Write a protein that binds this ligand. Sequence first.
Ligand SMILES: O=C(C[C@@]1(C(=O)Nc2cncc3ccccc23)CCOc2ccc(Cl)cc21)N1CCCC[C@@H]1c1cn[nH]c1
Lengths: 301, 305
Amino acid sequence: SGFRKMAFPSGKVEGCMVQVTCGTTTLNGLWLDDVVYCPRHVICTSEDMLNPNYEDLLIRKSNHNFLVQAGNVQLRVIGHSMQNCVLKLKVDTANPKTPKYKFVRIQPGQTFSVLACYNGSPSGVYQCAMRPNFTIKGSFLNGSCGSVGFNIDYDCVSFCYMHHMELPTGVHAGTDLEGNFYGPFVDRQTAQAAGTDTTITVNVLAWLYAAVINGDRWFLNRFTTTLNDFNLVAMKYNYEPLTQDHVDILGPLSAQTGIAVLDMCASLKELLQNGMNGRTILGSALLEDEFTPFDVVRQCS
Amino acid sequence: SGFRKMAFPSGKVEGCMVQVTCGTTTLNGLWLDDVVYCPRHVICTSEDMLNPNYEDLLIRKSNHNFLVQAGNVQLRVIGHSMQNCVLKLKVDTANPKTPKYKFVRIQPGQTFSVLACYNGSPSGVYQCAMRPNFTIKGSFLNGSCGSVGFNIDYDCVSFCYMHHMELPTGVHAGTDLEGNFYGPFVDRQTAQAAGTDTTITVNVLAWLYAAVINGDRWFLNRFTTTLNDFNLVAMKYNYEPLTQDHVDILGPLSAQTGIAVLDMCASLKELLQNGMNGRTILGSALLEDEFTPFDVVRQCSGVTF
Ligand SMILES: O=C(C[C@@]1(C(=O)Nc2cncc3ccccc23)CCOc2ccc(Cl)cc21)N1CCCC[C@@H]1c1cn[nH]c1
């Protein structure tokens, strides 16, 4: 019993964190085999940030301009290339702590753990989701750029996010490990704003099923709904449309609890209408949307 | 910007998790140097959990009854001893991944990271607090016993908790690494219930300061209160008494935000008697009490490990 927001053990990722310095800029790098991946804006100054020509800035750099530090050991950079918004620094030593890994691009609603680092030193681990507006509600300070998001499934680390910027509303934007940004963001200090955020409906439903598995049934009702009627109501609360894929994905939890997805949708409609009336669901007074259907199955039966 | 419930990086602890099997019971062990620490109830079966003379049950056991597994390598047990509710299994091999560590006993309100494991395999890390009723609101399933709680200070892992059991209300109970239970709990099959819980007041105040540092000021007011008037209010709402030590501990956050501790207490007093009025603080509709004053400083400054 118990339901917590849980991050993956960060050990496999900690052994990959390095410090990357270029001039006055110091951020984090991910050292996998003989390559260190980091945000390409490590070559920029604060003035360059408005309209940087990264290819023009990178052509003016040589290997010895990039100082890479793995603990108290400086790594020698023997090459450099840019792949989208990520700089790939070829180093002379392969990381002996390199885990089994892969680079995966996630979709909004998906969750992952963040290992927040400063100066190539991991300082904390937390769990979060890719918001439908492609931002993450992270916890990042100056120097955290290059911190990575990941999932671990049977000894394999799936790297899905690299932190690049903080938007004016306090939310964070970044890329997959191939340097492709999530969302309409650019690595420029130009006027960028996160689009209106929405609640990840499939995740709230998964979390309501986790509440039922943990013995919380107070919010259930005798009603059902059509998928269309659910979405007409959901849209008015800034909830993401529930697709037939979401309904299919919730199938196993529906079978485990004996509550049809469209019956669980009717409970959600009612919760949106009524609020919680001073009650909590899994210790929460708000509807939690940062646990996917797969996280629920993982953590509780 | 951003405020998350954050755990310490678990790497130094992951390199210590082992699987301990004795008879039908499988749980987790903490391998530090040549000793594996685990709950003493691993010797327990059907009649062992009911009327348990743990020294009498342990004296029967031979070293080879305890199967210890560190990854795909079986460790040979060369000795065994009990210290309170923890079994100490002397192994032949010293763990080469043993970090700099110490065993510390924490006080209620203090927070720590828990590396939840199943079969000596770490599966998740979460942050939590020792409740004033000595329970933890953790997330554990069968096989999680022996999972440990810890803090990191520089390069030193301070082991503070070892999971032993789940109470009927879904909360968890365990010991420090010397086998001494937190709270009035015993490690056996008996009617045990967590006492009525209270809110960790100093932690809610720290979290209100973290909200101010993150630009949330809607709950602030022009008012102040005396420590006694706040404590009369806090006692009514099942909040732990705020001591002068708590007020002193909140001093740095008070100096950073310009809000006196008793000034922030008046804000908390109003939140208790009037609620949040449909508003949230740091994305929360409830007053959060699982961030200590130190956690707030560490996260709203950027300390690394
Ligand atoms: O601070 C940036 C990147 C930046 C950004 O957003 N950073 C931050 C990230 N996360 C959390 C933060 C919290 C507080 C302040 C800054 C934060 C600045 C704002 O404008 C942009 C715009 C786009 C991009 Cl991709 C990046 C940034 N620096 C970049 C140029 C050199 C100095 C410097 C830096 C030094 N070490 N690492 C980076």
